[model samples]
Target chain A: AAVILESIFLKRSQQKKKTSPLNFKKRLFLLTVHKLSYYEYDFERGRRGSKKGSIDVEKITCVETVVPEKNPPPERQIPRRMEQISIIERFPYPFQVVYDEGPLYVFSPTEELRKRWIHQLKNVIRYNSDLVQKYHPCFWIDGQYLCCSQTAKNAMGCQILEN
Target chain B: AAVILESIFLKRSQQKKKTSPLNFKKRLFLLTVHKLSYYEYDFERGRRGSKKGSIDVEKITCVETVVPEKNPPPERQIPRRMEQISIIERFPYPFQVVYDEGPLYVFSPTEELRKRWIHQLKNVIRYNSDLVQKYHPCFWIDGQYLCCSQTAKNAMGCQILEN
Candidate 1:
């Protein structure tokens, strides 16, 4: 069953854990999945600026849709749609998610390098949250989780905010 | 042949639509999934100020693990440890597939009402595109799309954005 799935690419419900990393890096790259649909029309220009019109969307069911009673009948439930997300084709490095680990691992020669990545990740979340708020003020970017390998493990992932 | 069986949840996505009477309300919500073996870290101010060792996380599957070598992987696919997302629930409304003359019957109230919904849907698509380009810049503000809907269909919903 292809169900409609609604999600917030970031987790706004939680709190930030580590603000500092032992081995931090100055410059870092971030990869995340975010809210993918929304567009606007420039009435002054009278021309459509954002070309891609449709996005994949999902619908909530269980509680919302129920079999109609005898009298009025009921509304039909719509199937969910997936926004066509064009996952980027390139990046600084071809990233991949290794399995998860209990503690985040850092193989940096110095603690500063590890701290740099963590700091960078925090910055990325902060920057993106600020970016989204500037225009679409309704969303509350609560928190974003960073997954890293433990000292003895090798794995990393980032969890966005969704319900 | 045992195909991969995935349980698709479709109810929660429709909550917003059910709450509103308008035909054009877009369902929005957040969602995430985690395995039982995995332990989630709650990083509040307490966790932040403390030097409590490290939290263990679970291993995740990588993009390459699922895809065949022939098919290139997503640009920045992270391994799925804990997944988060914001998605809209969908519902099946009453409508007709037209052949020649205009649409014969729709589940909605009136032809004008149906047209209005279609228009709002288009506007939603337009807003999504505009929001996407602007997302990388700032945080989402409130009522941007609700205003658009009022301007287009004179419909309600998205009032939350106003706050």
Candidate 2:
């Protein structure tokens, strides 16, 4: 299938056992009819490099925006004092893609970019049989879920997912 | 084969022995993989009605912007002295789609809308074998061509068509 959408995004690493706030790195994301893939982006060369991750479009259960919290978690807040951590400020808009029974977080530099990606992602996954009816509106931070304060990482979402 | 683009545009009537400058009518233009179509748009109802015209995507020879003339033709300018004829001024961005060995002129309300329609139309017809290499930059007025001052209605184009 032809490429539906392609752009650079700040993707939060999904491989780590414990989520790290410092893992948001720029990656070239590409979406097709079959899958959504991300690759290592070379800033200086202005091109995508080796593939880092990919998710089958059919497997995406939910795609939506992550409601911004008033205060950042301790790990993410520590760098704010020094003020060198402009990364979070640079990409303020964030979104979540639920797949493989877990959430993958990604940040966009602009709200328009975030909205466009979510629209296309939601459109492609509309026919998914295992789509979640409810999803966590906030992030999972500091060994607890942000929305409902659930201790378990894989806890069922407390917020309703809009169609 | 889903809809690539859809919008309201002022389309000049093609069924005429002698061209009328005041023949532009507002129609809902729709483009799909197979064909480009237009429908009778009811402004009060704000919905599409009966089909007006259709053009096969395969038969499209060219799709590009028309160079705007400094002054309108006699027929189009007749209502201008009373200053009630705002049709040309209202939809100034005009584009041409060469099909059936003749150009179809459509006026867009905005430059962005015109750019978007032209972009999608060109993408769909890129692989067509009989694409035109040159085309008329102006309109057919008073039984004479405006671009090259050619007398023949189906005269060879004097302007090169950009790829």
Candidate 3:
């Protein structure tokens, strides 16, 4: 849909491979079917500043939340009840969009914002299955997995979804 | 004057002592009699983000232009024929702003914008001398050095302007 799905204020950390230091910077996030974008503000100027970056929905191969397997390192712990979304791209290095080689880290100011952003992103992927096929072998069904019908050598695991 | 003197885009480098890698970040610089503010945008989000910083006209001890003494380092060179404006604060360390000890650096997108900002800042300092005297010393007169008449012990050289 052309209409905006969600808008949020989040603290994005500089990307790191596993236990990178949490250098969180606040940003304004906008979600649309065409692309997902984020903007930074100039509070002193009392105005929105420049766009930090964006991701095309079509290029998003995966959208999943990152749960810390163990107690987070002291440096990684933020004051807020932090949540992260890992947006994987089709490229060999999915972090290129963020100008880094690590997974993109988007933090939510609140739990509600975190869940909403995740839901909407997943929804966008489900509704735009046509776009997903261009890069991925299976489509995400409202958080579930649905395999593509293209039966070819590359589609070796495509039948797994049917069963 | 309540009027906004000028608004232009510039790349501001992070303040670091000695040699700072020219990390030029784009900022929207807004000028007014009351204050000068700069905003930073997040291109990734495709939305105007939050503000980077602001400077009170009174706290500004100096505002002047800087011409590169020699050819700027390759990384320091921006795409445009940029000009730099050095804003010195009244603190022991100007880096108190932007959380660094370096003078606040404001760059202009073009030569015309650079001269215009400098001229306007000088005019603001001149016009607001009356206000500055309510709090500070050394009234300014359109590029002239004029002191306030309220000379007191605080004004060790206050009588210098008694004429």
Q: Best by TM-score, which number?
A: 2
> What is the Cα-based lDDT of residue B63 in candidate 3?
47
Candidate 3: C-alpha RMSD after superposition: 26.2
Q: Give me the overall lDDT of model 3.
A: 0.41
Scored by lDDT, model 2 comes in at 0.71
Q: DockQ for every model, please.
A: 0.02, 0.01, 0.01
List model 1 lDDT by residue over A33-146, tens digit each: 321222233336743345222211111000000111112111111223222221111111111111111221112222232334334333333433222111111111122111
DockQ of 3: 0.01
Root-mean-square deviation of every model:
26.4, 19.3, 26.2
lDDT tens per residue, model 2, B75-119: 322233322335434676678888865778887766677888888
- B70: Cα error in model 2, Å: 1.9
The 10-residue segment of model 3 chain A with minimum total lDDT is A88-97
lDDT of 3 at B45: 77
Instruction: Using lDDT, give the best candidate's number.
Output: 2
- Candidates sorted by TM-score, best first: 2, 3, 1
Q: Write the per-residue lDDT of candidate 3 for residues B1-163, one digit (tens) a residue.
A: 4746644454445433336554555565677777777776655774456887777775554444332212334343434331234221100110111111223555544444555666677666664432221111222222221232332312222111000
Model 2 DockQ reads 0.01
How far residue B22's Cα lies from its native spot in candidate 3, in Å, is 56
